[PDB]
Amino acid sequence: RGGITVLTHSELSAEIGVTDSIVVSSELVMPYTVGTWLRGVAANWSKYSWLSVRYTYIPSCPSSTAGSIHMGFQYDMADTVPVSVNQLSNLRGYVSGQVWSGSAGLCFINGTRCSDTSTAISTTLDVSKLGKKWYPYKTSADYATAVGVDVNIATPLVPARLVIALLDGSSSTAVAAGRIYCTYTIQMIEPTASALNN
Amino acid sequence: RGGITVLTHSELSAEIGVTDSIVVSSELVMPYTVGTWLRGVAANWSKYSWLSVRYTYIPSCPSSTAGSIHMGFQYDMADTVPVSVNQLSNLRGYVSGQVWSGSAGLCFINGTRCSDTSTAISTTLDVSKLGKKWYPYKTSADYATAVGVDVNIATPLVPARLVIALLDGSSSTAVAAGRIYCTYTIQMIEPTASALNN
Amino acid sequence: RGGITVLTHSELSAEIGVTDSIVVSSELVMPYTVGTWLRGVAANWSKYSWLSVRYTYIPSCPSSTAGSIHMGFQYDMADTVPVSVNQLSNLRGYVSGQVWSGSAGLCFINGTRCSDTSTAISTTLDVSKLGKKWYPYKTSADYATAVGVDVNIATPLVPARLVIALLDGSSSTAVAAGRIYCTYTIQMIEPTASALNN
Amino acid sequence: RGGITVLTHSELSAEIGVTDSIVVSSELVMPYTVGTWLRGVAANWSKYSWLSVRYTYIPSCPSSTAGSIHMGFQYDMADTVPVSVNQLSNLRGYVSGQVWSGSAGLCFINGTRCSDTSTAISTTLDVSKLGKKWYPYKTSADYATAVGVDVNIATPLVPARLVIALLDGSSSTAVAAGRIYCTYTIQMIEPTASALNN
Amino acid sequence: RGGITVLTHSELSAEIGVTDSIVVSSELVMPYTVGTWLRGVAANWSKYSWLSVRYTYIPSCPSSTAGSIHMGFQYDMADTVPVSVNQLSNLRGYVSGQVWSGSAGLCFINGTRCSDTSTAISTTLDVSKLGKKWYPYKTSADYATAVGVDVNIATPLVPARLVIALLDGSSSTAVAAGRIYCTYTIQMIEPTASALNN
Amino acid sequence: RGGITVLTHSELSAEIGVTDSIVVSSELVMPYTVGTWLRGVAANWSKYSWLSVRYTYIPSCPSSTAGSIHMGFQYDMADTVPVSVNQLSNLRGYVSGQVWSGSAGLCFINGTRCSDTSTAISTTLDVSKLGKKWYPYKTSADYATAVGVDVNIATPLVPARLVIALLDGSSSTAVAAGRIYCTYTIQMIEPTASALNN
Ligand SMILES: [Ca+2]
Ligand SMILES: [Ca+2]
Ligand SMILES: [Ca+2]
Ligand SMILES: [Ca+2]
Ligand SMILES: [Ca+2]
Ligand SMILES: [Ca+2]
C-alpha cells in the first residue's frame, strides 16, 4: 500500500564566483549531489523520482559587479560538456543573466505566490522526458567507479546534469557573486537502512 | 498485432532450512532465477514484464520447530545486502514469521479464494515502481559477467532481489523448515529461438 | 427425457503416511478409483461427467508430527510421473502443507458454509478443460489391460490423475498422518446392469 | 466457409426373425453400419455428427405371430452385451413390443406429422450425451482390426451400439417378423475421395 | 483461476522443393511437429487447443520456376494419404498454385492488415470441427509407438494432418521453390515440467 | 514548453545483394545507423523516441532473379544473432519474400494511401514494447566502446536491432537485388550543439 513519500524542499546547492574568463562546470541532477540535506534524507530510500527539479541563481553582490551566469541541461553523460556560451545556449532550459540579477527567482525557493519572475535566472528540469521515472539512489563514489568503467553506465543511474558557465567578470580572481539553490519535489520509494545504500 | 503472452503460475523457488545463527541470502527476481519451469518457458521470449510476483513461504515442519524467517526486497543491486534482522525489517515488503507458520499463504499459490491470510508469510513485488516495465530475459552466466564488470550494469537487467534471512533455530546444523514458492503473472514478448537467448 | 442423475458426495479416498524420504504416487480420477462408494454407485451407469472433483487432505496427527504433503494433477497418462517436489510444484492445482495441517479443508467435505480455508490442503479439478465431458465408466482391470497395450489408449478413458508426494517425515517407517477425501458432483447417464459394466 | 452437409433420410437397417428362445445381437451406430445407402454416401466425408438417429421396428407379420422384440443402447463397447430381457430393460432408450406391433412407428420414417405413436416400437439416440460430437467415418474392417488390439480403442471411433433381443416366438426356426429401419439427420464434414476413407 | 495461456505466433514449418513428378507428403498438425519453436514452448503444458492454425506457402524462386504446390487436410489418420492431385483437391482447405506464387500470403504471417490475399497459397484449419478441443501434448516418439500398435489410437492424440503435393517441376532433382510457415493462436493449459511431457 | 520536434521521413538504409548461401547480418535501430540523413539531423538533439520505425525492402532486379530475403527484430543485444532462416522466422516482425518481390511496400515510403500491401516485404517495430521510450542519441564509436566493455551496456542505449538474411541466390558472387529503406516518425528532444553529441 502506498509506498511513496513525497517531499518538496529547497536548499543551497552551490556557491558562485566570477572571473574575467569563462569557467564551465557541471553537477549531476541526483539526490546525492543536489545538496547535503537531500543527500542525507534520500539515502533512506532505494529509488526516487523527480516530480520537479529547478535550479535558481540568487545574487549576493553589488549592482556594479561585472559578470554573467549561464545554465542548461545535458542528458547523455557521454556527451561532451560545452566549452562556450554559444554551445551552452543550445541546451534545454538555457538561462542567462547578469551576475547581480536574479532576485526575482526567490519566490520559487520560498514556494510563495509570485508573478514577476521574468528576470529570474532559474531553470527547471523536463522531468517527463527523462530516460525513466524511477532512478536508484547513488553515492558519488559508486557512480564514479561505474562511469570509470564506461560513461554510458551512467544513463540508467542519473537523469541529467546541470551545466554552469561563468564569465564577463572583471577579475582573474573569483569574485563571490551569488549562490545556486535547488528546489525539488521528489518521490522516494522502497526504504532501506541508509548504511546499505551505495 | 498483440504480441503479449500472459501467463500466471506458481512453482517451487527454494528449499529452506534453519540454524541457531542468522544466515542472510538473496535471489534475483527474474524469470531465469525464480524457478526451473519459468526459466525454460520465458527463454523463448526476448523480454518480459512482471504484472505480479509474490514469494510465499510454506512450512513443512512440526509446530515445535524453533526458528523464524524474514524476507524483503532491494532494488539497487549495488546496495549492500542486509546483515541483520534490524536492517532487513526496513525493506519494502518485509515479512517475518515462525518457521512453522505460513500455511495460510497456500491460497495465493493455489490462486483460490481466501480471506484468512493474516498469518501468511508472503510478500509481493511493487511492480509499478520498478526501474522500467519491460526487461530483457537474462541467463545467470551473462548476468554474472555483466555485474563482474560493474554491479550497476545490473539495473537495466533486473528489477529487484529478494532478501531472505533465517535464524532463531535450535541447531547449528540446518533443519529443513519449509519452502519458498513464487507465484507470478508475467507478460512475455518478442519471441526468439531459446538457443539464442543469453 | 432427462437421463442425467446428478449426485454430490464425499468419501474416504486414501490413507496417508509419511517417511523421511520422498514417496510419489498417483491415482486415476475416475468413479471406480476415487472410492468404494462411488465405485459401486456409478457402475450402474454407462458414462459420467465430473461437474466438480476435489481432493482434500485431513490430518489426524499431533502438531509435532514431522512431514509435508504435496498434490497436483496430470492429464496425459503417457507423461512421466513427477519424481521431485520441484516437478510436482509445476502441476495444475498444486498444493503443499504440513502433514498436521489442513483441518480447514473439512468444510468442503461437509459441504457447509466456510470462509477460512486459506490453510486447506485441498485441490479441485479443472473439469472444463478435460479432454471431453462424458467418459465411460471403467474398471481397474479393463483399464489396466488397455494401457497394457499402449498408455495413450487411456486418454479417451480417463480425464486425469492425482499425483501425491510425501516427505520430510522423521521416520523411515511410515507414520500415519492423515487421509485424503474426495468430494464430487458427478452426472451419471445411460444406465446399465452393473454386471455388464467393464 | 460452411463445410457442413446436413442430410435427413431413412433406410432399411435389418431384417428381423423370431424363435422360441432369446437371441441377442447388436450393431454399431455409425454411418458404415446403419445401412448400405448412408454407408456409400458418408464415405465421401472424413467425419460426421449425429443430430438425430432413431431405430424403428416395422412389423410385416400376421397379428397371430408369437414373439416380442427388445431394443436399447450401450455406449462403452468394452461393456458386456446383455444376455437377458431383464438386463436389456435397464438400458437407455429401451423399448419392447409384440413382434406384430409397431405400425405406428411408420410416421417417423415417412417424416410425416403424427400424434398416435404410443405403440411405436422406436427408439432414438441421446446424441447430446455421446462421448463427442464429431466422429471419424470408419469401415467395418478398420474398426475390427482396432478393437482386435483392444476394445477400448472403439470409444473414440463409435458413439454407441444398438442392442436387439428377440424371443417368445413359437418356432425354433426363425419366423420373419419385421424389419428395423434407421432414420437419421447427419452432418457430414471435411470431404475426401471415398477410396481413401478407411 | 484462469489457467489458459494464449499465444499467437508464426514460424518456419518446412522447406519446399519441386521435381518433374508428384511427391506427396504430410505432417501432423500438433505443437511438436509444426515447428521447433512451438515444440519447445508447448512442451511446458499438458494439453492445448488450436484457436487458429494456418499453413502459408511463401515462394523464394524466380518467376520462371516450373512447378505447382497443393495442400489440404485429413482428419482420420487411418485414412489413406492421397496419391494424386485429383484426390488431394477433394480435401477440406485445398489450395493450389504456382511454385513461384504466394507472396500475398505474407500478411497472414506478419499478422498485418491486408486485403489482396486472393493469390495467397495459404490454408487454415477448421478448428471448430475437430474431434475435440483440448488435445494432449505429444512427442513424435510416443505418437509413433502408439500408431505402431494401431493407427486409430491417433484420433484422440492429434486433430489432423496437412497433406502436401509437389509436381510440374522441370527437373528430376528437387529445386528449392519456397517454404511453408505455420501461423497459430494456441491455448496451452495445465503446466508441467517439460522433462515429463511425452 | 513543448520541447518535442516530431519528424516523419524515409531514406535509404542499405543496399542488398544475394548469393547461393545464407548471409546473416544486423543493424542497430537508432538514429545514427538507420541512415545518413537522420544521423545528421538527430545529432542536434540529446535524446529521441521512436513513434514508428519500419524497414521496407524494395526490389530492383528482374523477376527471374533467384533468391529470398528475411528480416526480424531482436531486443537484447547480448542475444546471439540467428544463423538460420529457421531461427530468424521465430523473431518478432519476421517477414520473408522473393528477392524480386516487395514493390507493394513502396506506398509506406511514399506515405501515400494504399490497400494492396499483402506482398510488401516490410516490417515495423513494436515501439510500445521497447525497454523505454526516450533513448540517448549515440554514435557508432561511443556505442562500440561501450559494448566493448560489456554487451549489456547496450540495453539502455539502443532499443533493438534488425536482423537480415539473404540466400537462395544463383551465384556465389553477390547479385544486386534491391534496397532496404527506413521510414520513421521520430520525436527529438533536448537540443544540443551537434559537435558535443557522442
Ligand atoms: Ca543505492
Ligand atoms: Ca536475452
Ligand atoms: Ca464400462
Ligand atoms: Ca476414415
Ligand atoms: Ca504429453
Ligand atoms: Ca549522445
Pairing label, strands F122-124, E135-136? unpaired
The DSSP bridge partners found for residue D53 are D184
For residue D5, the CA-to-ligand 1 centroid distance in Å is 70
Closest C-alpha among E86, E76, E119, E117 to residue E101:
E119
Which cell numbers hold the place of D190? 471435411
Q: Using only C-alpha atoms, what is the Rg of chain F?
A: 17
The answer to whether residues F15 and F99 touch, using CB atoms and an 8 Å cutoff, is: no
The residue type at F191: P
The answer to whether residues D131 and C156 touch, using CB atoms and an 8 Å cutoff, is: yes
The answer to whether residues F51 and F7 touch, using CB atoms and an 8 Å cutoff, is: no
Q: Which residue shows C-alpha cell 523421511? A: C20
The residue type at C80: T
Closest C-alpha among C182, C181, C189, C164 to residue C18:
C164
Among left, alpha and beta (phi > 0; psi -120 to 50; other), residue A168 is left
Which cell numbers hold the place of C120? 486447506
Domains identified in chain C and CATH numbers:
1-198 (2.60.120.20)
CA distances, C196 to each of C5, C45, C136, C192 (Å): 19, 10, 13, 7
Contact state of A191 with B90 under an 8 Å Cβ cutoff:
yes
Judging contacts by C-beta atoms under 8 Å, the chain C residues touching residue E47 are 75-76, 129, 131
Q: Does F130 touch chain B (CB under 8 A)?
A: yes
Closest C-alpha among D186, D187, D166, D185 to residue D121:
D166
CA distances, F102 to each of C111, F71, F117 (Å): 66, 13, 9
Pairing label, strands C45-59, C175-191? antiparallel
| Residue in D136, D189, D196 nearest the CB of E82 | D196
| Phi, psi (deg, nearest 5) at residue A39 | -55, -45
- Grouping H, G, I as helix, E, B as strand and the rest as coil, residue D24 is strand
For residue D136, the CA-to-ligand 4 centroid distance in Å is 6
| Phi, psi (deg, nearest 5) at residue D142 | -60, -45
User: Would you mind telling me the total number of residues written for chain A in this entry?
Assistant: 198
Q: Which residue shows C-alpha cell 541508509? A: A194
Q: Hey, how many other C-beta atoms are within 10 angstroms of the C-beta on A173?
A: 9
Chain B CA closest to residue E38 = B44
Buried-state track E149-184, b at ≥16 Cβ within 10 A, e below 16: bbbbbbbbbbbbbbbbbbbbbeeeeebbbbbbbbbb
Burial class of residue F8 in the structure, from the number of CB atoms within 10 Å of its CB (0-12 exposed, 13-18 middle, 19+ buried): exposed
Q: Hey, how many other C-beta atoms are within 10 angstroms of the C-beta on E36?
A: 19
Give, for A140, the enclosing helix (H) or strand (E).
helix A140-149
- Grouping H, G, I as helix, E, B as strand and the rest as coil, residue B103 is helix
Which cell numbers hold the place of B56? 510465499
Q: Hey, how many other C-beta atoms are within 10 angstroms of the C-beta on B128?
A: 11
Chain F CA closest to residue E36 = F86
Q: Using only C-alpha atoms, what is the Rg of chain E?
A: 17
For residue A79, the CA-to-ligand 6 centroid distance in Å is 5
Q: Which residue shows C-alpha cell 519451469? A: B37
CA angle, E103 then E104 then E107, to 5°: 110
CA angle, D18 then D21 then D25, to 5°: 65
Closest C-alpha among D129, D128, D123 to residue D165:
D123
CA angle, E17 then E22 then E24, to 5°: 80
| Residue in C65, C97, C123 nearest the CB of B103 | C97
Which cell numbers hold the place of B53? 510476483
The DSSP code sequence of D52-119 is: EEEEEEEE-S-TT---EEEEEEE--TTSPPP-SHHHHTTSEEEEEEETT--GGGHHHHH----S--TT
CA F40 vs. chain centroid, Å, equals 17
Which ligand sits nearest to residue F194's alpha carbon? 6
| 3-state SS record for chain A | CCCCEEEEEEEEEEEEEECCCCEEEEEECCHHHHCHHHHHHHCCEEEEEEEEEEEEEEECCCCCCCCEEEEEEECCCCCCCCCCHHHHCCCEEEEEEECCCCHHHHHHHHCCCCCCCCCCCEEECCHHHCCCCCEECCCHHHHHHHHHHCHHHHCCCCCCEEEEEEECCCCCCCEEEEEEEEEEEEEEEEECCHHHCC
| Phi, psi (deg, nearest 5) at residue B108 | -70, -40
The distance of F11 to chain B (nearest Cα, Å) reads 26
Q: Which residue shows C-alpha cell 520509494? A: A189
Judging contacts by C-beta atoms under 8 Å, the chain B residues touching residue E40 are 44, 194
Pairing label, strands B161-167, B68-74? antiparallel
Among left, alpha and beta (phi > 0; psi -120 to 50; other), residue D50 is beta
Sign of CA dihedral B25, B29, B30, B36: positive
The residue type at C78: A
The residue type at F41: V
For residue B76, the CA-to-ligand 1 centroid distance in Å is 5
Closest C-alpha among B198, B194, B196 to residue B44:
B194
Sign of CA dihedral D142, D144, D150, D154: positive
Which cell numbers hold the place of C165? 508426494
Distance in angstroms (rounded) separating the CA atoms of residues B181 and B165: 16
The answer to whether residues E73 and D3 touch, using CB atoms and an 8 Å cutoff, is: no
Among left, alpha and beta (phi > 0; psi -120 to 50; other), residue D168 is left
How was this structure determined? It was done by: X-ray
* Chains touching E, CB cut-off 8 Å, 3+ pairs: B, C, D, F
CA F87 vs. chain centroid, Å, equals 18
Q: Hey, how many other C-beta atoms are within 10 angstroms of the C-beta on D85?
A: 16
Distance in angstroms (rounded) separating the CA atoms of residues D136 and D198: 9
Distance in angstroms (rounded) separating the CA atoms of residues E63 and D118: 72
DSSP type of residue E27: E
Q: Does E85 touch chain D (CB under 8 A)?
A: no
| Phi, psi (deg, nearest 5) at residue D173 | -100, 130
The DSSP code sequence of F26-73 is: EEE-SHHHH-HHHHHHHTTEEEEEEEEEEEEEEE-S-TT---EEEEEE
Give, for F26, the enclosing helix (H) or strand (E).
strand F23-28
Distance in angstroms (rounded) separating the CA atoms of residues E17 and E15: 7
Q: Which residue shows C-alpha cell 518478432? A: F92
| Residue in F63, F115, F119 nearest the CB of E62 | F63
| Phi, psi (deg, nearest 5) at residue F196 | -95, -10
Q: Does B174 touch chain C (CB under 8 A)?
A: no
Q: Does B132 touch chain E (CB under 8 A)?
A: no
The DSSP bridge partners found for residue C85 are none
| Residue in A142, A156, A190 nearest the CB of B75 | A190
DSSP type of residue C60: -
Which cell numbers hold the place of C191? 444406465
The answer to whether residues E167 and E20 touch, using CB atoms and an 8 Å cutoff, is: yes
Contact state of E5 with B6 under an 8 Å Cβ cutoff:
yes
- Grouping H, G, I as helix, E, B as strand and the rest as coil, residue E187 is strand
Torsion of CA B47, B52, B53, B59, to 10 degrees: -150
CA diameter of chain D: 57
The residue type at E85: V
The DSSP code sequence of D138-191 is: --HHHHHHHHHH-GGGGTTT-S-EEEEEEE--S-SS-EEEEEEEEEEEEEEEEE
Q: Does C185 touch chain D (CB under 8 A)?
A: no
- Grouping H, G, I as helix, E, B as strand and the rest as coil, residue F138 is coil
Sign of CA dihedral D124, D130, D135, D139: negative
For residue E197, the CA-to-ligand 5 centroid distance in Å is 4
The answer to whether residues F190 and F3 touch, using CB atoms and an 8 Å cutoff, is: yes
CA B84 vs. chain centroid, Å, equals 19
**Upper half-sphere CA count for residue B116 (Cβ side, 13 Å):** 11
Distance in angstroms (rounded) separating the CA atoms of residues F93 and F95: 6
Q: Hey, how many other C-beta atoms are within 10 angstroms of the C-beta on C150?
A: 20
Q: Which residue shows C-alpha cell 427425457? A: C1
| Residue in C3, C46, C146 nearest the CB of D74 | C46
**Upper half-sphere CA count for residue D144 (Cβ side, 13 Å):** 6
| Phi, psi (deg, nearest 5) at residue B178 | -175, -160
Residues 6+ away with beta carbon under 8 Å from D141: D198
Q: Which residue shows C-alpha cell 500478411? A: E107
The answer to whether residues A164 and A28 touch, using CB atoms and an 8 Å cutoff, is: no
**Helix, strand, coil % over all residues of chain E, rounded to 5:** 20, 40, 40
Sign of CA dihedral D39, D43, D47, D52: negative
Residues 6+ away with beta carbon under 8 Å from D7: D41, D185, D186, D188
Distance in angstroms (rounded) separating the CA atoms of residues A93 and E196: 61
CA angle, E6 then E11 then E14, to 5°: 135
**Upper half-sphere CA count for residue F186 (Cβ side, 13 Å):** 28
Contact state of B181 with C101 under an 8 Å Cβ cutoff:
no
The answer to whether residues A79 and F198 touch, using CB atoms and an 8 Å cutoff, is: yes
- Grouping H, G, I as helix, E, B as strand and the rest as coil, residue A115 is coil
Distance in angstroms (rounded) separating the CA atoms of residues C37 and C34: 9
Neighbours of ion ligand 5 (CB under 5 A): C 76, 79; E 136-137, 197
Could you give the residue ranges of the DSSP H alpha helices within chain F? Answer: 31-34, 36-42, 85-88, 106-110, 140-149
Distance in angstroms (rounded) separating the CA atoms of residues E130 and E108: 22
User: Would you mind telling me the total number of residues written for chain B in this entry?
Assistant: 198
Q: Hey, how many other C-beta atoms are within 10 angstroms of the C-beta on C54?
A: 19
The residue type at C82: P
- Grouping H, G, I as helix, E, B as strand and the rest as coil, residue B76 is coil
* Terminal-residue alpha carbon distance, chain A: 26
The answer to whether residues C122 and C95 touch, using CB atoms and an 8 Å cutoff, is: yes
Residues 6+ away with beta carbon under 8 Å from E30: E135, E137, E138, E143, E157, E158, E159
User: Would you mind telling me the total number of residues written for chain E in this entry?
Assistant: 198
Which cell numbers hold the place of A50? 523527480
- What order do you get walking across the sheet with C23-28 strand by strand? C23-28, C161-167, C68-74, C92-98
- Grouping H, G, I as helix, E, B as strand and the rest as coil, residue E36 is helix
